[PDB]
Amino acid sequence: EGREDPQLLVRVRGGQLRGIRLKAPGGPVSAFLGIPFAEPPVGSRRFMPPEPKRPWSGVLDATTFQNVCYQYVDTLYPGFEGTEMWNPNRELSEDCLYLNVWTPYPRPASPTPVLIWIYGGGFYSGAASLDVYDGRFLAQVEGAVLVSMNYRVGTFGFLALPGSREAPGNVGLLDQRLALQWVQENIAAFGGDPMSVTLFGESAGAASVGMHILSLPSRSLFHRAVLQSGTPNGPWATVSAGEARRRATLLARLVGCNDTELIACLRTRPAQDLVDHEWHVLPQESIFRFSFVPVVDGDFLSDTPEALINTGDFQDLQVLVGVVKDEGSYFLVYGVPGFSKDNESLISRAQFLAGVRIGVPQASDLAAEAVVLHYTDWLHPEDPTHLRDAMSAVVGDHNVVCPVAQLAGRLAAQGARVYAYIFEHRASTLTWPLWMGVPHGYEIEFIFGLPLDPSLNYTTEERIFAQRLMKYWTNFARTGDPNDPSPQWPPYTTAAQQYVSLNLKPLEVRRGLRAQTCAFWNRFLPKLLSA
Ligand SMILES: *[C@@H]1O[C@H](CO)[C@@H](O)[C@H](O)[C@H]1NC(C)=O
Ligand SMILES: *[C@@H]1O[C@H](CO)[C@@H](O)[C@H](O)[C@H]1NC(C)=O
């Protein structure tokens, strides 16, 4: 100490930290990156619930992002920014339980509302250090205290032998919870208000948020919640204990392995070997399905998310939820024949029927025909453009839009204050093809205010747009109302089903979140599948 920037030295429960002055377009922010919050979940701790980080001595340097949790690395389009932006940007390691904090510079004088980000990536990938999660803009422009944590994904985070001691399941979610607890105890040191904590996340991050809402021990740890393009209910975010057990033992076999001994063998395997077989345990050929996700353990999750939302009391809850215009397009190039980023992906009626079986992998023959019947345009049954887009809609509706619809409806019917949106602006910088429209994941860069960074080549209108969204999100975190005390954003209600469009145009209000089609997925399909 002595000749150091006095405004970057901070103490937390575990010890002393030195952070970094970062440049944002409109001025400096304080960043504290790679703060450990758990004991490394390595060796005999693999598959185990996280234990809190033991205090250290000296000044921990907190000026760079820490390791990314060990994970699958995408290879579909090597070199292509559209896929690479989501790939790990620091060394892969099982020792990865660290978190990040951005705050105004100098730090806030009064207690500031805290946003906590939880990244998505199907519960098998992701990292808080990605460029699209850069907190400097929300910190600098809105004066937010922003926190984001790494959590274990894949087998390391979610492989479960339900009931066992050595692999209880959901430890990735416990990593998240431990970091929420860390914020409660320590965020005041940075000027953050522990009594105003809003969770937000996208895709599996969104599902994670939803699960914290549904799990009592997390409830005391936050006050409001944003769920972007993801839900804890729906077909991909959880598996039953039986299915978890089945996938865990299959994967053990594949790598050469009484729960205790099985798990102990798994713990002897190099991280990379587990990753190399993680995609080989899915029950059917599929897209938008992930091998190791939260399990219904009857503990963290006392029952299925469907049951928990259908019956829970949510009077104290304020939630913001929404979707992008083309939730499904992204996923089609990852396993539906006929789809590519490199061409128009016009497909035949045959490819559409085949796409449906892969897109709705759990459907019986009858259920799948119902899907094809509903989505077919009977004026143009064979039109390759309609079919391409209908395949997208099937995947988007089944996995995101309708699970979101069910969530908003149940939450509202049961006391929560809900705001709902659809994001419809396509980044002028998007590198995916036009046919994909506004794909899943591509609102995030706007919510975090990347267009304010002049070197990123967004349009002036995109810059203004981003600022608006930053205002909505931070207003909602601040007050539980996106609106600024300009057209208004009404709550979503069972009776009016109102939501807003988010684009370059001023807020426009709409009614019914795919009401008709979602009745099919949410009300009819369940009944049909039995049997
Ligand atoms: C686009 O690419 C995919 C995969 O290479 C291919 O199957 C399909 O035939 C192509 N579409 C057209 C109409 O050229
Ligand atoms: C932005 O535009 C300039 C000028 O064309 C270009 O040289 C630069 O690489 C661009 N940056 C990005 C990331 O698009």
**Is 354's C-beta closer than 6 angstroms to any atom of ligand 1?**
no
DSSP secondary structure of 300-322: SSSS-HHHHHHH---TT-EEEEE
> Which residues are paired to 489 by β-bridges?
none
**Is 241's C-beta closer than 6 angstroms to any atom of ligand 1?**
no
Question: Going edge to edge, which strands form the sheet with 15-18?
Answer: 9-12, 15-18, 59-61
Place of tokens 């798994």: 266
By annotation, the residues acting in catalysis are 203, 327, 440
User: Could you tell me if 125 and 86 are in contact, meaning their C-beta atoms sit under 8 angstroms apart?
Assistant: yes
Q: What secondary structure, in 3-state letters, does 69-92 show?
A: ECCCCCCCCCCCHHHHCCCCCCCE
CA–CA gap between residue 492 and residue 498 (Å, rounded): 5
For ligand 1, what atom is nearest to the CA of residue 337?
7
Q: How far is the CA of 368 from the centre of ligand 1 (A)?
A: 24
The SS3 of residue 200 is: strand
Helices and strands in the chain, H and E counts? 19, 16
Tell me the ligand closest to 454's alpha carbon: 2
Ligand 2 pocket (Cβ < 6 Å) reads 456-457
**Is 346's C-beta closer than 6 angstroms to any atom of ligand 1?**
yes
Phi, then psi, of 33 in degrees rounded to 5: -105, 145
The SS3 of residue 453 is: coil
Tell me the ligand closest to 335's alpha carbon: 1
For ligand 1, what atom is nearest to the CA of residue 343?
1
Q: Cβ neighbours of residue 227 under 8 Å, at least 6 residues apart?
A: 200, 201, 206, 207, 209, 210, 319, 320, 321, 322, 404, 407
Q: How far is the CA of 232 from the centre of ligand 2 (A)?
A: 39
Mutate to test the pocket of ligand 2, among 428, 455, 462 (most ligand atoms within 8 A of CB): 455
For ligand 2, atom 5, the nearest C-alpha belongs to 457
User: Could you tell me if 50 and 39 are in contact, meaning their C-beta atoms sit under 8 angstroms apart?
Assistant: yes
221-233 residues labelled b (16+ CB within 10 A) or e (exposed) = bbbbbbbbbbbbb
For ligand 1, atom 14, the nearest C-alpha belongs to 343
For ligand 1, atom 11, the nearest C-alpha belongs to 345
Q: CB count, 10 Å around CB of 220? A: 10
Q: What is the CATH topology of the domain spanning 1-531? A: Rossmann fold (3.40.50)
Question: How many residues belong to the chain?
Answer: 531
CA–CA gap between residue 358 and residue 367 (Å, rounded): 13
- List the Cα angle 74/343/358 in 5-degree steps: 60
* Six-digit token string for 364: 């019986």
Q: How far is the CA of 334 from the centre of ligand 1 (A)?
A: 13
CA distances from 259 to 245, 249, 252, 417 (A): 10, 9, 11, 44
Mutate to test the pocket of ligand 1, among 340, 342, 346, 383 (most ligand atoms within 8 A of CB): 340
User: Could you tell me if 117 and 200 are in contact, meaning their C-beta atoms sit under 8 angstroms apart?
Assistant: yes
DSSP secondary structure of 472-502: HHHHHHHHS--S------PPP-TTT-EEEEE
**Is 338's C-beta closer than 6 angstroms to any atom of ligand 1?**
yes
Task: Give rounded-to-5 percent helix, strand, coil for the chain.
Answer: 40, 20, 45
Give strand ranges (E) for 292-401: 318-324
